Design a protein around this ligand. Structure first.
Ligand SMILES: Nc1ncnc2c1ncn2[C@@H]1O[C@H](COP(=O)(O)OP(=O)(O)O)[C@@H](O)[C@H]1O
Ligand code: BEF
Length: 389
DNA sequence: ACCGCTGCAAGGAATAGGATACTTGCGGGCTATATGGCGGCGAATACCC
RNA sequence: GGAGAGGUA
DNA sequence: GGGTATTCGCCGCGTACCTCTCCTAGCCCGCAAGTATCCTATTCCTTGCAGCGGT
């Protein structure tokens, strides 16, 4: 009955056709100072052909982290601004939202087009101005979190929508963003699908694509599943400090993180530490993110806001503290978030007492330890299927 | 004497764990179709006048 | 209490 | 009617003792036990409205 309200098998849509100029797109390729992997090229060809088709997309590009997936979005946005179709981008954070903001600014500091962000960082006074500008269409590239899906943003011609890290998103988020215009091209970027989406990809009802081709210098990431030792963490911190890198410290607490920062400072007097949590006024958060870009302090304690990831090649090691309750997707994503460089990264994993571990925690840890190699996220997602169900 | 700010609830994503509705085999409690034995004898038909 | 089987004189 | 033959069915078949076993069938409804499921918590994130210093 619900579908009979639409009077179609999800088929009342006619879609849209994009026009691409081969020379213009080739010029944008020239503005990209890199060479894409063959599977990245295949994904580019598939997405460009699909948008050239007069139908709307729902395409999964589920490849492992560190495979330059974002550049596919960069080129999609370039072809969107070629048509001037008011592209919007969604990510469930502010850190990676800022990362995408600056990346798009870099991609379009040569191409005349307007890129901006709308999130908690912006004041409402300028949020209203952003909404007015996107109502008149003077803005083409917007980056922001769920503020857009609050029945407040107005688009003269909403023609392209982008979503990153489909995981951690509840249902009806995609429906709320779809409600505005049916024939918009949906580009679903992600690192790992949740079981339902992966099963639907298997069904073939949604377009799917995989990029099993890592960059040249992306060597593996070492992993070490160890019991709670206060010395391995210190010596690994020193190992990366002598290397000249940044350590990602995970503890997953917003109360004892304060004490833990000074505790690990006493453990490692050589370490310069900043304190990070999502319950902060965000001014010092962006300031210390800038500091991290400058690597003035080495090791950062943080909650799961780090999961989205703005990894710098300088960072080459992650030490966690809680290893009893974390999903396999998160484990693999934070494993692969490190790197983007020629240098061998590391992933030091700290576990509390083995007998305090429940059976499922043992299964998760043994599974993540069993597999350690490139192109491991997709197979890990397949294994997570039949586990989470 | 008006305002933008902080802060304090309401609703999304990840784990453990008891309650409790659901399913099942029973134990006692109850109700309701033959075929290898003769002999004697008296009554009951059959019969053919 | 009643049936069935075997046995003794 | 009547004297007769033929058939049908009922009646009957020793006394005393010892050992052993087994004695209605089937349905049905309460009921004990065992279980899969559903609601109950914890941790993270991003909103929406009421106080509130400050001027
Ligand atoms: N084929 C390649 N060769 C060398 N470096 C690459 C290649 N593809 C991507 N990179 C680099 O690796 C980084 C990966 O970042 P990102 O696009 O966020 O990857 P992912 O989205 O998979 O995490 C990019 O910033 C880019 O500079
Ligand atoms: F979206 Be990614 F993994 F940078």
């Amino acid at each position: 009955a619900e579908l009979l309200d639409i009077y179609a098998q999800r088929a009342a849509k006619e879609g849209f056709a994009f026009k691409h100029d081969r020379e213009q797109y080739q010029l944008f390729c020239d503005s990209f100072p890199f060479e894409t992997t063959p599977d990245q090229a295949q994904a580019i060809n598939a997405v460009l052909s699909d948008m050239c088709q007069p139908l709307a997309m729902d395409r999964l590009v589920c490849g492992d982290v560190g495979f330059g997936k974002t550049e596919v979005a960069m080129r999609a946005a370039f072809l969107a601004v070629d048509n001037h179709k008011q592209v919007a981008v969604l990510v469930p954070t502010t850190l990676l939202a800022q990362q995408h903001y600056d990346n798009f600014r870099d991609r379009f500091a040569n191409w005349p087009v307007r890129i901006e962000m709308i999130s908690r960082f912006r004041s409402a006074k300028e949020q209203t101005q952003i909404l007015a500008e996107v109502a008149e269409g003077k803005i083409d590239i917007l980056i922001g979190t769920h503020k857009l899906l609050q029945s407040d943003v107005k688009f003269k011609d909403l023609g392209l929508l982008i979503v990153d890290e489909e995981h951690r998103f509840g249902v009806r988020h995609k429906e709320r963003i779809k409600a505005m215009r049916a024939n918009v091209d949906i580009l679903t970027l992600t690192a790992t699908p949740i079981p339902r989406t992966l099963n639907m990809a298997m069904s073939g009802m949604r377009d799917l694509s995989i990029i099993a081709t890592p960059p040249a210098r992306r060597l593996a990431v070492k992993t070490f599943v160890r019991e709670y030792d206060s010395m391995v963490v210190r010596e690994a911190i020193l190992r990366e400090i002598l290397r000249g890198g940044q350590v990602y410290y995970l503890y997953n607490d917003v109360e004892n993180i304060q004490k833990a920062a000074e505790r690990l400072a006493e453990l490692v007097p050589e370490a310069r530490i900043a304190i990070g949590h999502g319950q902060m006024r965000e001014r010092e958060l962006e300031r210390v993110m800038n500091d991290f870009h400058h690597q003035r302090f080495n090791v950062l304690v943080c909650t799961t806001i780090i999961e989205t990831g703005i990894d710098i090649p300088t960072a080459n090691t992650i030490i966690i503290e809680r290893a009893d309750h974390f999903g396999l997707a998160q484990l693999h994503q934070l494993r692969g978030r490190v790197g983007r460089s020629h240098h061998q990264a590391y992933a030091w994993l700290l576990t509390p007492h083995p007998k305090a571990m429940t059976t499922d925690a043992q299964k998760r840890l043994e599974a993540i330890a069993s597999l350690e190699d490139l192109g491991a996220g997709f197979a890990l997602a397949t294994h997570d299927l039949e586990i989470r169900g």
